[PDB]
C-alpha cells in the first residue's frame, strides 16, 4: 500500500481545522500579543511532530513536501500525467 | 536623492522616501519631521503640494543634513586638531549612543568592517 507510511503530513495540519475560526474573534486578546508571551507562545516546542508550522504540503500518494493547495488540494505538477481528469482550475500548464 | 540629498529608495510612498534625508536619525529625527510638518495620513490620492512648498523652507531655515553632520562630528576637530579628546572620541568607535566598541556594536567605524 505505502499510503499510511507516506501520510506523515496528513495528521499534522488536521486537528487544528476548526480550533481558531470561532475563537480568534472572541479571544483576540489571547491570540494577539499585547506587547510578550515568551512562555505561553513557546509551548509549541513540546509537540515535535504536529504543529501549524509543520505544514509540508500533505500528499498521501508519495509523502513528499510538494503538491498541495489550501483552496482544493489539487495537483500542480502531477497534471502532466493527469491533465485529462479536469482537476485544473486556476492553475494550468503554461503553453498558450 | 532629494533637493540636496541622496539614498533614493525604490518604489516607496511619500513619507517613506522624502524623509530619507541624512539629517533625520535616531534622536534628531523628531525635530526635522516636526519642521517638515508631514505625516503618513496623506495617501497618494490625498498627497498635497505642501511638501514641495515646504522642502525649500525646511532645508534653508533649518540646519542642512550635510553641514549639520559636519559641525556635529567633523568641524569640531577639523580646525581644532589639538590633543583634545572630544574630536577623537567620535572617530574612535567607543560608545557615543550606547554602542560598545567591539562586542557586536562596531557602529561608528563607518563602512561594514569585522
Amino acid at each position: 500500500a505505502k499510503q499510511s507510511m507516506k501520510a506523515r503530513e496528513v495528521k499534522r495540519v488536521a486537528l487544528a481545522d476548526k480550533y481558531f475560526a470561532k475563537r480568534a474573534e472572541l479571544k483576540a486578546i489571547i491570540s494577539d500579543v499585547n506587547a510578550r508571551w515568551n512562555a505561553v507562545l513557546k509551548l509549541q516546542t513540546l509537540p515535535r511532530d504536529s504543529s501549524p508550522s509543520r505544514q509540508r504540503n500533505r500528499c498521501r500518494q508519495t509523502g513528499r513536501p510538494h503538491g498541495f493547495l489550501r483552496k482544493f488540494g489539487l495537483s500542480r505538477i502531477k497534471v502532466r500525467e493527469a491533465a485529462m481528469r479536469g482537476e485544473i482550475p486556476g492553475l494550468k500548464k503554461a503553453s498558450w | 536623492a532629494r533637493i540636496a540629498g541622496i539614498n533614493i529608495p525604490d518604489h516607496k510612498h511619500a513619507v517613506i522616501a522624502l524623509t530619507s534625508i541624512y539629517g533625520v536619525g535616531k534622536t534628531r529625527s523628531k525635530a526635522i519631521l516636526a519642521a517638515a510638518g508631514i505625516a503618513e495620513d496623506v495617501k497618494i490620492s490625498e498627497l498635497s503640494e505642501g511638501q514641495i512648498d515646504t522642502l525649500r523652507d525646511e532645508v534653508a531655515k533649518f540646519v542642512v543634513e550635510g553641514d549639520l553632520r559636519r559641525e556635529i562630528s567633523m568641524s569640531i576637530k577639523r580646525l581644532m586638531d589639538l590633543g583634545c579628546y572630544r574630536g577623537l572620541r567620535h572617530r574612535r568607535g567607543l560608545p557615543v549612543r550606547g554602542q560598545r566598541t567591539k562586542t557586536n556594536a562596531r557602529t561608528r567605524k563607518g563602512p561594514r568592517k569585522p
Partner: protein, 79 residues
C-alpha cells in the same frame, strides 16, 4: 533558561561539540554564540567562542547544568 521550559541549545556549539564529546577534540570553532549553556559531560573543557573580542574560557562543574556561557565568560569591556 530563557525559554522558561524545555531548555535547548543553539547550533553554535553543536556544530562540533556533539562530535568532540566522544571523538576527542577538534580545531577551534568560529562560534559567535552568547546564549549557549554548558553540560557536565564536558567538565574541564571550554568551547572556543568568538564573541567579538577574543577566545574566552568557560569554567564548568557537575553542579552547573543550565548555566549560560555568557554568564561564565565575561566579555563586554566598556572603555
Amino acid at each position: 533558561r530563557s525559554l522558561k521550559k524545555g531548555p535547548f541549545i543553539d547550533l553554535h556549539l553543536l556544530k562540533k561539540v556533539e562530535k568532540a564529546v566522544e571523538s576527542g577534540d577538534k580545531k577551534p570553532l568560529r562560534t559567535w554564540s552568547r546564549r549557549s549553556t554548558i553540560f557536565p559531560n564536558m567538565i574541564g573543557l571550554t568551547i572556543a567562542v568568538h564573541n567579538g573580542r577574543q577566545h574566552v574560557p568557560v569554567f564548568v562543574t557537575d553542579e552547573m547544568v543550565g548555566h549560560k556561557l555568557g554568564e561564565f565568560a565575561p566579555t563586554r569591556t566598556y572603555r
